[model samples]
Target: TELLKPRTLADLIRILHELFAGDEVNVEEVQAVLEAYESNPAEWALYAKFDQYRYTQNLVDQGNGKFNLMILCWGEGHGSSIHDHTDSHCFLKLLQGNLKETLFDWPDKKSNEMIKKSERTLRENQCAYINDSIGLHRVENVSHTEPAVSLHLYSPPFDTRHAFDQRTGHKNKVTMTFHSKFGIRTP
Candidate 1:
C-alpha cells in the first residue's frame, strides 16, 4: 500500500489521503510517505517557479479542509521570516539544492524575541517536520550560488501567521499569500 511512486499531483494526493485516512495520523507515517516519494522530483517541475523573492506555489487544496500542498522556491541567500505555522502541523521536504532550518526558543512569551534553539542543514531528499509546540523557526537557502526548492505540506491551512522581528521584539500578523498556482504567477 505504499503507492510510493507519484508521477502526478493526483497520485500524490491519493497517497496523502490513504496515509491520513485513519482517525489518528502519525507524524512518522507522514515522514514515511515523504521518504517513499523522495525521488519523484520530475512531477514537481510544474510547480518550481523561482524568484529572488521567496515564492510560494500552491499545488493542492483539499475540499475536506484537512490539508494542502505547496512548493517554495528560494533564490540564493533567501530565507523566510521567523514565524509559527498558526498551530498547524507542518512538513518540509527539500527537493533541490540545500537549505538550513533554524529553530528558536522564546524566553519570554510576552516578548516577541527568540533565541536559537538548534539549526540543521538539509540537502536534497531530506525532510523535516514541525508541530505547533515547536516554537518559531525559519528556513534559508544556504547556498549563495544555487537556488533551493522545497515542498511544504500543512494540515488545516492557515489564514494568517505571526511574523517576528528579532531585533525589536516586534511581532506582526501577516496574511498568507501565494505567489503562484500550478506554476503560474498570480495577478
Candidate 2:
C-alpha cells in the first residue's frame, strides 16, 4: 500500500494512534509502514534522495509524535553517536541513501555490549521504527563517497536524550549528557 494521504499532523497522529494505541509502542506499526513503502518503492524513490525534499514536499507525512517529521542528511563521513531516545518512539525512513544501523545489547547494569545484529543498506523507501527499548543504535551514510538522507518521526516533541562514551571501559556507567537542538548537536 502507498502512504495514506495525510492532510495534517492531526491526521498522521490519528492514523498512528489507531495502530499504536495501547500496543506498548512496539515494532508492528513500524513494520507496517515499511511494508507500505516497500510496496511503493518507485514512488518513494524520487523523495528519498534527500530529507528536505521529502519533508518540504510532503510535510503531511511528518509529526506523528513529539517531533514535526525530520530528515537527516549526512555528508561523507557523517554519522551519529551511540544514543537512545529518552521518551519517544522514532520511525526512521530511508529517504535518500544507505543507512548502516547497528543495535547493541545491554549485558548488565554497568555496560552494554554491541550485539550481533542486522545491517541494512536501506535504500529509497526503506524504513524502521525505533522505540525506547533497544534504541541503543547508531546510523551513518556509509557512502564515504556520497551522502545519504533520512526522515525521522517522533511523537509529542523532544529536546534531550542520553548519550554515552562507553567506548572506553566497562562496569562504570559514566555518560556525557547534553541537549539537542533540532535533533543534532551544536556548539
Candidate 3:
C-alpha cells in the first residue's frame, strides 16, 4: 500500500481531518497519519526553527476542538519536564536534529514515585506518540551544539498538564500557553 505524502501543512491537516472524522479515533488511525508526515521533512521544513530557548508554536486548531497542531523548538540541552498529558493523546514527529525521550512509570500512585521505564533517541524523521495508557515522559534535545524541532498533534487539546519531579515526588500543575499562533509570534 502506498502512503500519501502531504505537500504542505494544510495538506496534512486535511489528512488528519479525514483520519479523525470517524465516530471514534483510535491509535492505529493516528499512527497511520503520523507515519505519513514523519518521513516527509521537506514538506514541513518551513515550520522548523530554533532559538536559544525552547518554545511551542501553535499551527492549527480544529473548529470542533477535537485536535490542535503545534511546532516545538528545543534549544541545545533543552527539553520538556517529565509530564502527563491530562488524558489527551499526543503524536510527535522529529523534524530537525535529535531528541532524547525518557518515559517513566508511577509505581505507587499515592507516593508519587516515578520509575524509569524506557528511553529512545529520535533523530530527524522519527515519530512517537503517548497517551494516558503510556504514563509520563520527558523530551530533550541531546545535542550541545544544535537545536531540535518537532511537530506535535494533540487530541481534545490539553489546556493544562502536570509536571513531575521524581527526586522530590512532587507534581506541579502547568497552565499551557502558545508561543505563537498560525506561525505568528504572540505577544
Best by lDDT: 1
Taking all chains together, the TM-score of candidate 1 against the true structure is 0.87
Per residue, candidate 2 scores C-alpha lDDT tens digits across 90-116 of: 777765667888765433555454553
Q: Ranking by lDDT, best first?
A: 1, 3, 2
**lDDT of all predictions:** 0.75, 0.53, 0.74
- Scored by TM-score, the top model is 1
Give candidate 1's total backbone clashes. 0
**Residue pairs that clash (backbone atoms under 3 angstroms), model 2:** 48-95, 48-96, 65-154, 65-155, 65-156, 66-154, 66-155, 66-156, 66-157
Q: Compared with the true structure, what per-residue lDDT tens digits does model 1 show for residues 1-187?
A: 4546655556767778886676556787787677556545567787787775665555644525667678888889889988888878888888888899998764465655566889999878777898759778888887889888888888767878888777655778998787777667775
lDDT of 1: 0.75
Clashing residue pairs in candidate 1 (N, C-alpha, C atoms within 3 angstroms) = none
Score residue 43 of candidate 3 by CA lDDT: 59
Clash totals for all candidate models: 0, 9, 0
TM-score of each: 0.87, 0.59, 0.86
